[PDB]
Design a binder for this molecule. Structure first.
Ligand SMILES: CCCCCCCCOCCOCCOCCOCCO
Ligand SMILES: CCCCCCCCOCCOCCOCCOCCO
Ligand SMILES: CCCCCCCCOCCOCCOCCOCCO
Ligand SMILES: [Mg+2]
Ligand SMILES: [Mg+2]
Lengths: 7, 369
């Protein structure tokens, strides 16, 4: 699993 | 402007893995992407500062920078025990040639610090070629090297699709060699090829041909360092075999006449090949073929040690022999799952040799996509 969060 | 990410995965070879990164997309207007990434599995911890620019020149020449730290525990990767802590840097330029070809060239520095080496013949042969003479009856040792490398690479990619390909070929050739002034003196070449041949119009039945080759040797009396060895066996090379079991086994010196073992050490030469019949997945609609894939495969491979001194160890296998080809057959299953890219295989090692270890069921959940 990979969670990606643009800031 | 920026992003960050976190990953959790699992492998039969690697155990539970973790990934984390943070990237600033444009640093004070330079056009360079600066980032920090880290990963950890049962036998490896790795961290780096990345600097990248897809348009170093307006033509599309890319730059790629690295400042890294790496911690490798060889026993947790099912090899004869040792520890290698290293750090260094790399600069790499990427030159696109056409849509399907790229070249890359770069300079590398790496510091390697080896400790906790369990005395065995092949590892000690390399140490002796380097002027190292640690006791053979003792695991408290230390060898530190500084190396500068020239790196080159070539990638051919004409896969119709990045994920679950149905047509085309992919070739990746990497080379590296030490620049005089390094402690080590050696070169290393890797070759990976994948070819997908669809047999039906709708591309639901495909034939996949995979090969993987590796060869390195020392220069001027040195040998290639064993922590650059090739390995084979596991979920991504020869399925049905325990990770890295294929190839030479450690011949241990007595602690305080030698002991044949089944602990893999890898080697400086390697050849792996696979033939795989991709087909539709039973009980599943082919609308999901872009996300689900079944395949039957025939895997084969060998690893060997070209400098095994058979003269001096007649009573033991000649590990320079490249002809002991391991083979397996089995079935694989891949799925873009909610938990991430997923691969389950069952395979039977039907040609194996003295000391090889089996791992019929193998499972992997990726942590990068
Ligand atoms: C070794 C890899 C380091 C990755 C660290 C991730 C940082 C995530 O923090 C995001 C919040 O930043 C706001 C300041
Ligand atoms: C975030 C990755 C950091 C990589 C660490 C660089 C280590 C270089 O320091 C070497 C110490 O030399 C003295
Ligand atoms: C060691 C640096 C080598 C520099 C190579 C640059 C070649 C890139 O050419 C781009 C334009 O192509 C013509
Ligand atoms: Mg241990
Ligand atoms: Mg054992």
């Amino acid at each position: 699993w990979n969670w990606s969060k643009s800031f | 402007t920026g992003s960050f990410n976190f990953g959790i995965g699992y492998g039969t070879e690697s155990g539970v893995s973790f990934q984390a990164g943070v990237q600033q997309d444009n640093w004070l207007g330079t056009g360079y992407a600066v980032g920090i990434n880290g990963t950890k599995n049962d036998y490896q911890t790795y961290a780096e500062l990345s600097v990248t620019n897809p348009y170093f020149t307006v033509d599309g020449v890319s730059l790629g920078g690295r400042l890294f730290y790496n911690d490798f525990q060889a026993d947790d990767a099912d090899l004869s025990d040792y520890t290698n802590k290293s750090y260094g840097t790399d600069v790499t330029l990427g030159f696109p040639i056409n849509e399907y070809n790229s070249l890359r060239a770069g300079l590398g520095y790496v510091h390697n610090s080896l400790s906790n080496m369990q005395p065995q013949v092949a590892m000690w042969r390399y140490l002796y070629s380097m002027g190292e003479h640690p006791s053979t009856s003792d695991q408290d040792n230390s060898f530190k090297t500084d190396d500068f490398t020239f790196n080159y690479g070539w990638t051919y990619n004409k896969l119709d699709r990045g994920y679950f390909p149905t047509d085309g070929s992919r070739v990746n050739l990497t080379g590296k060699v030490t620049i005089p002034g390094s402690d080590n003196e050696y070169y290393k070449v890797t070759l990976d090829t994948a070819t997908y041949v669809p047999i039906d119009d709708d591309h639901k039945w495909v034939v996949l041909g995979r090969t993987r080759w590796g060869y390195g040797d020392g220069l001027g009396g040195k040998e290639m360092p064993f922590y650059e060895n090739f390995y084979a066996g596991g979920s991504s090379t020869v399925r049905g075999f325990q990770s890295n079991t294929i190839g030479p086994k450690a011949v241990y010196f007595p602690h305080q006449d030698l002991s044949k073992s089944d602990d893999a050490v890898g080697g400086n030469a390697m050849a792996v090949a696979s033939l795989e019949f991709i087909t539709p997945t039973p009980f599943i609609s082919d609308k999901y073929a872009n996300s689900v894939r079944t395949s039957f495969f025939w895997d084969m491979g060998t690893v060997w040690d070209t400098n095994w001194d058979s003269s001096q160890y007649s009573g033991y296998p000649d590990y320079s022999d490249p002809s002991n080809i391991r083979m397996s057959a089995g079935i694989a299953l891949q799925w873009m799952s909610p938990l991430g890219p997923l691969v389950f295989s069952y395979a039977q090692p039907f040609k194996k040799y003295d000391g090889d270890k089996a791992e019929q069921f193998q499972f992997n959940i990726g942590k990068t996509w």
